[PDB]
Amino acid sequence: MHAYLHCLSHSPLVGYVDPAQEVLDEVNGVIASARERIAAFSPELVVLFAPDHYNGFFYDVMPPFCLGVGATAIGDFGSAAGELPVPVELAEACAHAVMKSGIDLAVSYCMQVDHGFAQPLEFLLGGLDKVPVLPVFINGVATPLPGFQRTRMLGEAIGRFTSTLNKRVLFLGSGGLSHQPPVPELAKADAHMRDRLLGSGKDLPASERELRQQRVISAAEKFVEDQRTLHPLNPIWDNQFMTLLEQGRIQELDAVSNEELSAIAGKSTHEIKTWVAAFAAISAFGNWRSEGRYYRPIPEWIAGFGSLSARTEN
Amino acid sequence: MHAYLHCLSHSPLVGYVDPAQEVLDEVNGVIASARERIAAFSPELVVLFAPDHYNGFFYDVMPPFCLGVGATAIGDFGSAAGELPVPVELAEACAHAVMKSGIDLAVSYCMQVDHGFAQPLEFLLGGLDKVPVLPVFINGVATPLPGFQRTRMLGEAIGRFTSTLNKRVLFLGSGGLSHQPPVPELAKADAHMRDRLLGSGKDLPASERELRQQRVISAAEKFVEDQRTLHPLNPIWDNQFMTLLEQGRIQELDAVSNEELSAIAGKSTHEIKTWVAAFAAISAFGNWRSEGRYYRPIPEWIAGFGSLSARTEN
Amino acid sequence: MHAYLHCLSHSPLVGYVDPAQEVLDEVNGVIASARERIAAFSPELVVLFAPDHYNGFFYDVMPPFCLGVGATAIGDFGSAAGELPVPVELAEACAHAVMKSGIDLAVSYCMQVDHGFAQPLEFLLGGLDKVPVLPVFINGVATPLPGFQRTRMLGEAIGRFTSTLNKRVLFLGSGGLSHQPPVPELAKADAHMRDRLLGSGKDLPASERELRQQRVISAAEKFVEDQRTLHPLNPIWDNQFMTLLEQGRIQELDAVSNEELSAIAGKSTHEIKTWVAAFAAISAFGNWRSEGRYYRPIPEWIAGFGSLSARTEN
Amino acid sequence: MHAYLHCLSHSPLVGYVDPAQEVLDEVNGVIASARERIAAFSPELVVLFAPDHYNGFFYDVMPPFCLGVGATAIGDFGSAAGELPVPVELAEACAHAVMKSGIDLAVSYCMQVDHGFAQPLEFLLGGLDKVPVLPVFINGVATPLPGFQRTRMLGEAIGRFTSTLNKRVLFLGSGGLSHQPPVPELAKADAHMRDRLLGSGKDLPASERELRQQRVISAAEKFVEDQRTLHPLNPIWDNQFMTLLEQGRIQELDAVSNEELSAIAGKSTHEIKTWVAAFAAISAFGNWRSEGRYYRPIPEWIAGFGSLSARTEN
Amino acid sequence: MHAYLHCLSHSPLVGYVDPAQEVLDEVNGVIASARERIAAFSPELVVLFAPDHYNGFFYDVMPPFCLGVGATAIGDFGSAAGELPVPVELAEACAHAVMKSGIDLAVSYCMQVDHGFAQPLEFLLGGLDKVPVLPVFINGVATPLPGFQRTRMLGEAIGRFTSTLNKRVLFLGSGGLSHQPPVPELAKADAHMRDRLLGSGKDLPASERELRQQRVISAAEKFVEDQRTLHPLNPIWDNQFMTLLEQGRIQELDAVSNEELSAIAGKSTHEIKTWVAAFAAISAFGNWRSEGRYYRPIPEWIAGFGSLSARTEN
Amino acid sequence: MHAYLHCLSHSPLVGYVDPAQEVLDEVNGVIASARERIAAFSPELVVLFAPDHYNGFFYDVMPPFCLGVGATAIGDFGSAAGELPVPVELAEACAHAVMKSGIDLAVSYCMQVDHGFAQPLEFLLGGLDKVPVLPVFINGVATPLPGFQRTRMLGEAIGRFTSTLNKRVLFLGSGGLSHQPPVPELAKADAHMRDRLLGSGKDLPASERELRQQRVISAAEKFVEDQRTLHPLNPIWDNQFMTLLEQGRIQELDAVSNEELSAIAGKSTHEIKTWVAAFAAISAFGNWRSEGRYYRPIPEWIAGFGSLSARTEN
């Protein structure tokens, strides 16, 4: 059995607000190197964990985990749009096995996904339709939120299921590190914002999407001006987190509460739960080891960019 | 601490197809007696487990468990319609505590409910708005389905949470016993039926609702003609199940697989999972004992009608 | 101690309905290669697990496991007919030891067997009378059925018994993978079909045998036309099953219920229980390893053909 | 829950060879007293363990345990003949549950039974058709034989299953104590005797039945002449066995091997395994206590007559 | 051995901002009743847990727990001022034993205390110098903060130590329930505010004290105007907490993180840790039971007033 | 991960009272060799455990452990004076993690330190500002005192925290071995000495500092005259202690009570607790080994000079 893992922050701000071009070159070089490593691995199946940003899931129903038997990228932020090559029958078998294993997993047959699902596929495989995909959505914005413990459990379940497919599997994690975009809050939402959150946000007009993009860009530029306008980045905790992952010590993450993490690093950090899931999955394939570790704070994009890869040693 | 529990089959066929009027009188007498016992108990908070019949939850997102912070009865089958008195803040606290306890529970702020939520409230409390409610939906129709183990876990979580509210609590279970209405299947669904299941079933026209009601009535009359046209009722398993509940031996239900139960009693039986949840909850209040046990097969209504109650011994 | 194991689907449809001749050549090549490997091993004793198809066991008495002290092939489907070289005294000792070990095993002194016992012997050893045999029948058609747990237990018992014979042992598994021939059902059987199932099926006239063969052939051709006329094949589950066997993880099969498997793959799949027994047996000889894995779905023969071998590493 | 148990030796020699008439009166008085106690209990369901004497089960297939979904008494020795009121659906559910529990239990839809099943019903209920019955056959003549351990396990399984029927249950044990009738042996059987044992013994002519009856009568009279012509009775072991049962210490019977018992008391003693099963069953109903203990050796009938009863203390 | 426990919110706003006078009367009645119960108990030693409000402990050194061998009330808010009758030698022995038991406890020989230590003594004993005292300070304002686990451990240590003094002991808890006064924050503190926090706050001029009092009064009046200007009160969590204490289930409080509590109820809630300590202490005296439970939210005083008492049953 | 450890006695008497100059040369050679080894290691972060001598901590508050977020050396005994390069944010994260781990740790933002913190930095790194520092103060003079058990626990907590910083870490221990300077005692302190101990000792005039220095020098010369004027040195226990450390057997130090050690070696020995902490820390980095062991009693300086180093084996 063989397995390859890669986790990568996603940049909604690509071509909108940009840092010194040299840094951009370094980032692109890292991306290309990872892409080449994967192409060398030549995967057959792609498992993709990713969060959403109020595009398909809304407060009409908000599950902690969802699995997309049918998915479609809506092409936000100029990202790719269209359907995704999901192996329906395999997906249904996976859902059945996971839920039997003791995880409470919603399913969906027409899922709407955004750049959070698009960018990793484009950057790492050069298109949406290259390889069969198993999109898995993890809530990371709307409280209450799943804890680290359950996320690890979910990762292990999917890992043990896929370990018996006799294929070469690639796991992706698409959550950025500590950062804070200007995300609306339901508690302080007005009537219209509440209505958008409740389920009318599937059909946002292009004007509203552009307005939200401008909000994100302006907040990012303000964060460039000062890190205290929002939660300043925490390089210390980022390095802590990645190092904990590398040493294979995810057990120790159970001790952290959700709002512990919210207080330390800011509420948008919960995206990183995707990473945890990914790593848990690979631990079901026997021993392994990491590589390609890279990190860099970026004032221009609120995010602290990071990337990591791991590979099973057969 | 004090707690009262009651489980009762729901009859969508009330006034459409009817048995010998004497049986109807006996049923109504049982209902009235239970109602009087509850009124004697004088509850302060009502926790209500119930299934759906493709009215608010559709294959756009289908969670195994959902909790309704905001709910509204749509008045199907001539049942009551309108909003429900949900204690918002209490509901949010409950959701937080449950999910922290290790259960993966979706939430919703605008839930659509049908007779499955209406009839028990009307019959046992004389109206929707009498007491604060905590509506909890459990999937029982669309595979994959939660197992008995997880349902018991959910019940225990809610039970331990509510045990510390220092109130008098009433638990309701609204799932009928073994039966089979003519429920559409997504696997064999046509394009239009699939579209209705995917999420367009929230806005079914009155013509479609009447057509579905006529389908149910006709299938019920056919089942009256013969029990082999569909799955014949299994009185043996019904009595087995109730007796297992009475003796407080729900642990032994873990050994049963979902499609074990489907094969033995027919796929519609999964509704009874609500009952399990209810009983698990009351076990968190200390010792207790049952009463009011009653059961009777009914050819006219596909269901095998049943009812049960239990009470904590302080 | 030395042991060799081989499992192979049996094709009642050989020369009746046939696929593209190239596929036939590939199949025969695989068979010949396995035969040569066995001939290299040069066994002294053959333990043979196989199912029946209503030929000697009938509802007069239907045991879950039976051991044939005396056996005779009746030459169905043009397969070989005649007696089998059973080492009587060794067989009786085996039965005694197995039953002492805690398995409830019927015995028989005049067993009637069909192609399910003939084809593997002919194809792998070139005749019925080449080597001493221990025929063991496992029920796989008439409910209730033994579970995976007990089948594994039986395999282990026979394995530990034979491990002390100081011989070179060959284990055979003769159950096909997921498929569905047109098997009669006692529940829906008419008076005559019920009478045939009850015990009068030992003396089926050649006309009835030919009629049943024609039923099988016609149903196979219909299944060629469409896989939904009956249960479509499940390549996913087949590969799952074989991979689980190869990694030596049969323990995880205990979690599957009989009608779990029936729902996933179709009721005829229960034949594969033979395979499980075989593998369990070899695990009693110390460490081992697999080889020769091969699989291919075949529309023409309802079966999904498969084959596997394993060998102890002394 | 309520349960009553009774075990009683069966006398094939009633009216053929008789002891002093006073002893006969005492025996009949004991029988009548037990009958009255049962009639006071007023059972709803009867579970009946009994052995056979080469009348329906023959070496074509010989299971250790069998359960009769359909049964018929053939009226041997002038005993009653006709069908038995078996609750088919309940029987099938019982078989399913037992086999799931981990016991390997054959089933049969047309079972032939003899006086061993008739006499207890006539003597204790006054007819075959008074109450629903669950006939369970236990092998006690043809080696290899089930051990005490497995018999206890079977009893417990049936007990826990029936405990949830919410009925009043009566358990019967119909095996005599230590004795030895002239039973043919397959090992020393001639060609004709072997053929009769193999399966042609279902249709024994009345001449052969009368010959076998005369053999039994003559051997009984010889045993009257001397207890050393066959195995002499062992009153010590009989009292040992009953006392062990009364104190609820059946666990200690596991240490006894089958041929330990054969050597101590004679090979026909294995019938008493029925008793063990019965007692195990009642232990699943909570605490209980015994009564009516009675024993007496009888030279005239080879058997050492015994009888015992027990009752749950609610 | 005998022990009495009482916990009571402290009101810095007494006579500054006042609610409806009837509520004031009810509060005073509760206080008087508790006082009478204590006077009936007639204690010999008083253990007093209380927080501070930047009056003696400052960021020059900020311990999690401190024990005052010598203490002095500075008479803030018009509360009493002067020394406290501390049994020096007993105090030193207590410190030694506690630290030996495994708790890391600072000590101080000249401690400055404020109304948080004064009001309970005046209200419950009618003066500072009535009974010997053991003042114990618990940090509840300056992060990082001790968790519930360690606080319980501290309580148990003191409890077991005092249990062997052969005296009648009274435990006091002086932390208010959920509320939020306008407390300065070091992170956002200016140069002067930081200097005051660092240790120059021991000698605050009367002008600064009056300014801080006016800040508290104005913030309280604003909170009267709206509960969202600061964190609104959480009656649900208050009742949760008290009920958990009453049932003797403080173990379950370990699962709560500090900033869990901060998020749910507001950062000032940490005062209630005193209560936990108190209860833990009494658990070292054998069984006990509660009484006098009382609670009431008050808009006028930001606090949600509460009071509770418990007593050992000898 | 990589870690280097070094422990070294501190000599307040440098240039005041001196031994034979050859011994001085040997000491300086050892110091230089250790310095070169460290410079080869090239550390990035320095964790420094050290005691105080009544310079910043006084009986106003005396914690067992304190962590200095902000520190300043006051230049006693002619040692260096000025600020220290403390990585504020890293320090706060460390404090949070340690206290969460279950250690009760005070914090301070303006800490005053003396030669006990200065000399090791100057001698081993050539200045105060070379590397980031984490000053940690351990009480070793004022009873009650922390035990060995808790000190080891503290060391382990800091070790596991720093192990995930992905840096190269240097641990320092700055406590001398068995000795006794003329330290004032609070119990026998007069009014003025008590006032100095209570907190007025932060602002000791240069005259008082010179007087205390002269007291130390005179007591040292008297100890040169005779070792019985104070507690004579215990070379046996010193070698015992170092050997126990080298073999990695610090667990066995838990059995020693504080005043056990006080009786054996004299009350000033408690300084060595720093060493214990250091070693515990390094044990969190995996295996390691010691070197550079050196010891020598010195009559002239009351101390028994010692030095030790250890290094992780990657």
UniProtKB/TrEMBL annotation, chains A, B, C, D, E, F:
CDD domains: MhpB_like. Pfam families: LigB. It comes from the Bacteria. One of its GO terms (biological process) is 3-phenylpropionate catabolic process. Its cofactor is Fe(2+). Pathway: Aromatic compound metabolism; 3-phenylpropanoate degradation. It is an enzyme of class 1 (oxidoreductase). SUPFAM superfamilies: LigB-like. Catalyzes the non-heme iron(II)-dependent oxidative cleavage of 2,3-dihydroxyphenylpropionic acid and 2,3-dihydroxicinnamic acid into 2-hydroxy-6-ketononadienedioate and 2-hydroxy-6-ketononatrienedioate, respectively. This is 2,3-dihydroxyphenylpropionate/2,3-dihydroxicinnamic acid 1,2-dioxygenase. The gene is mhpB.
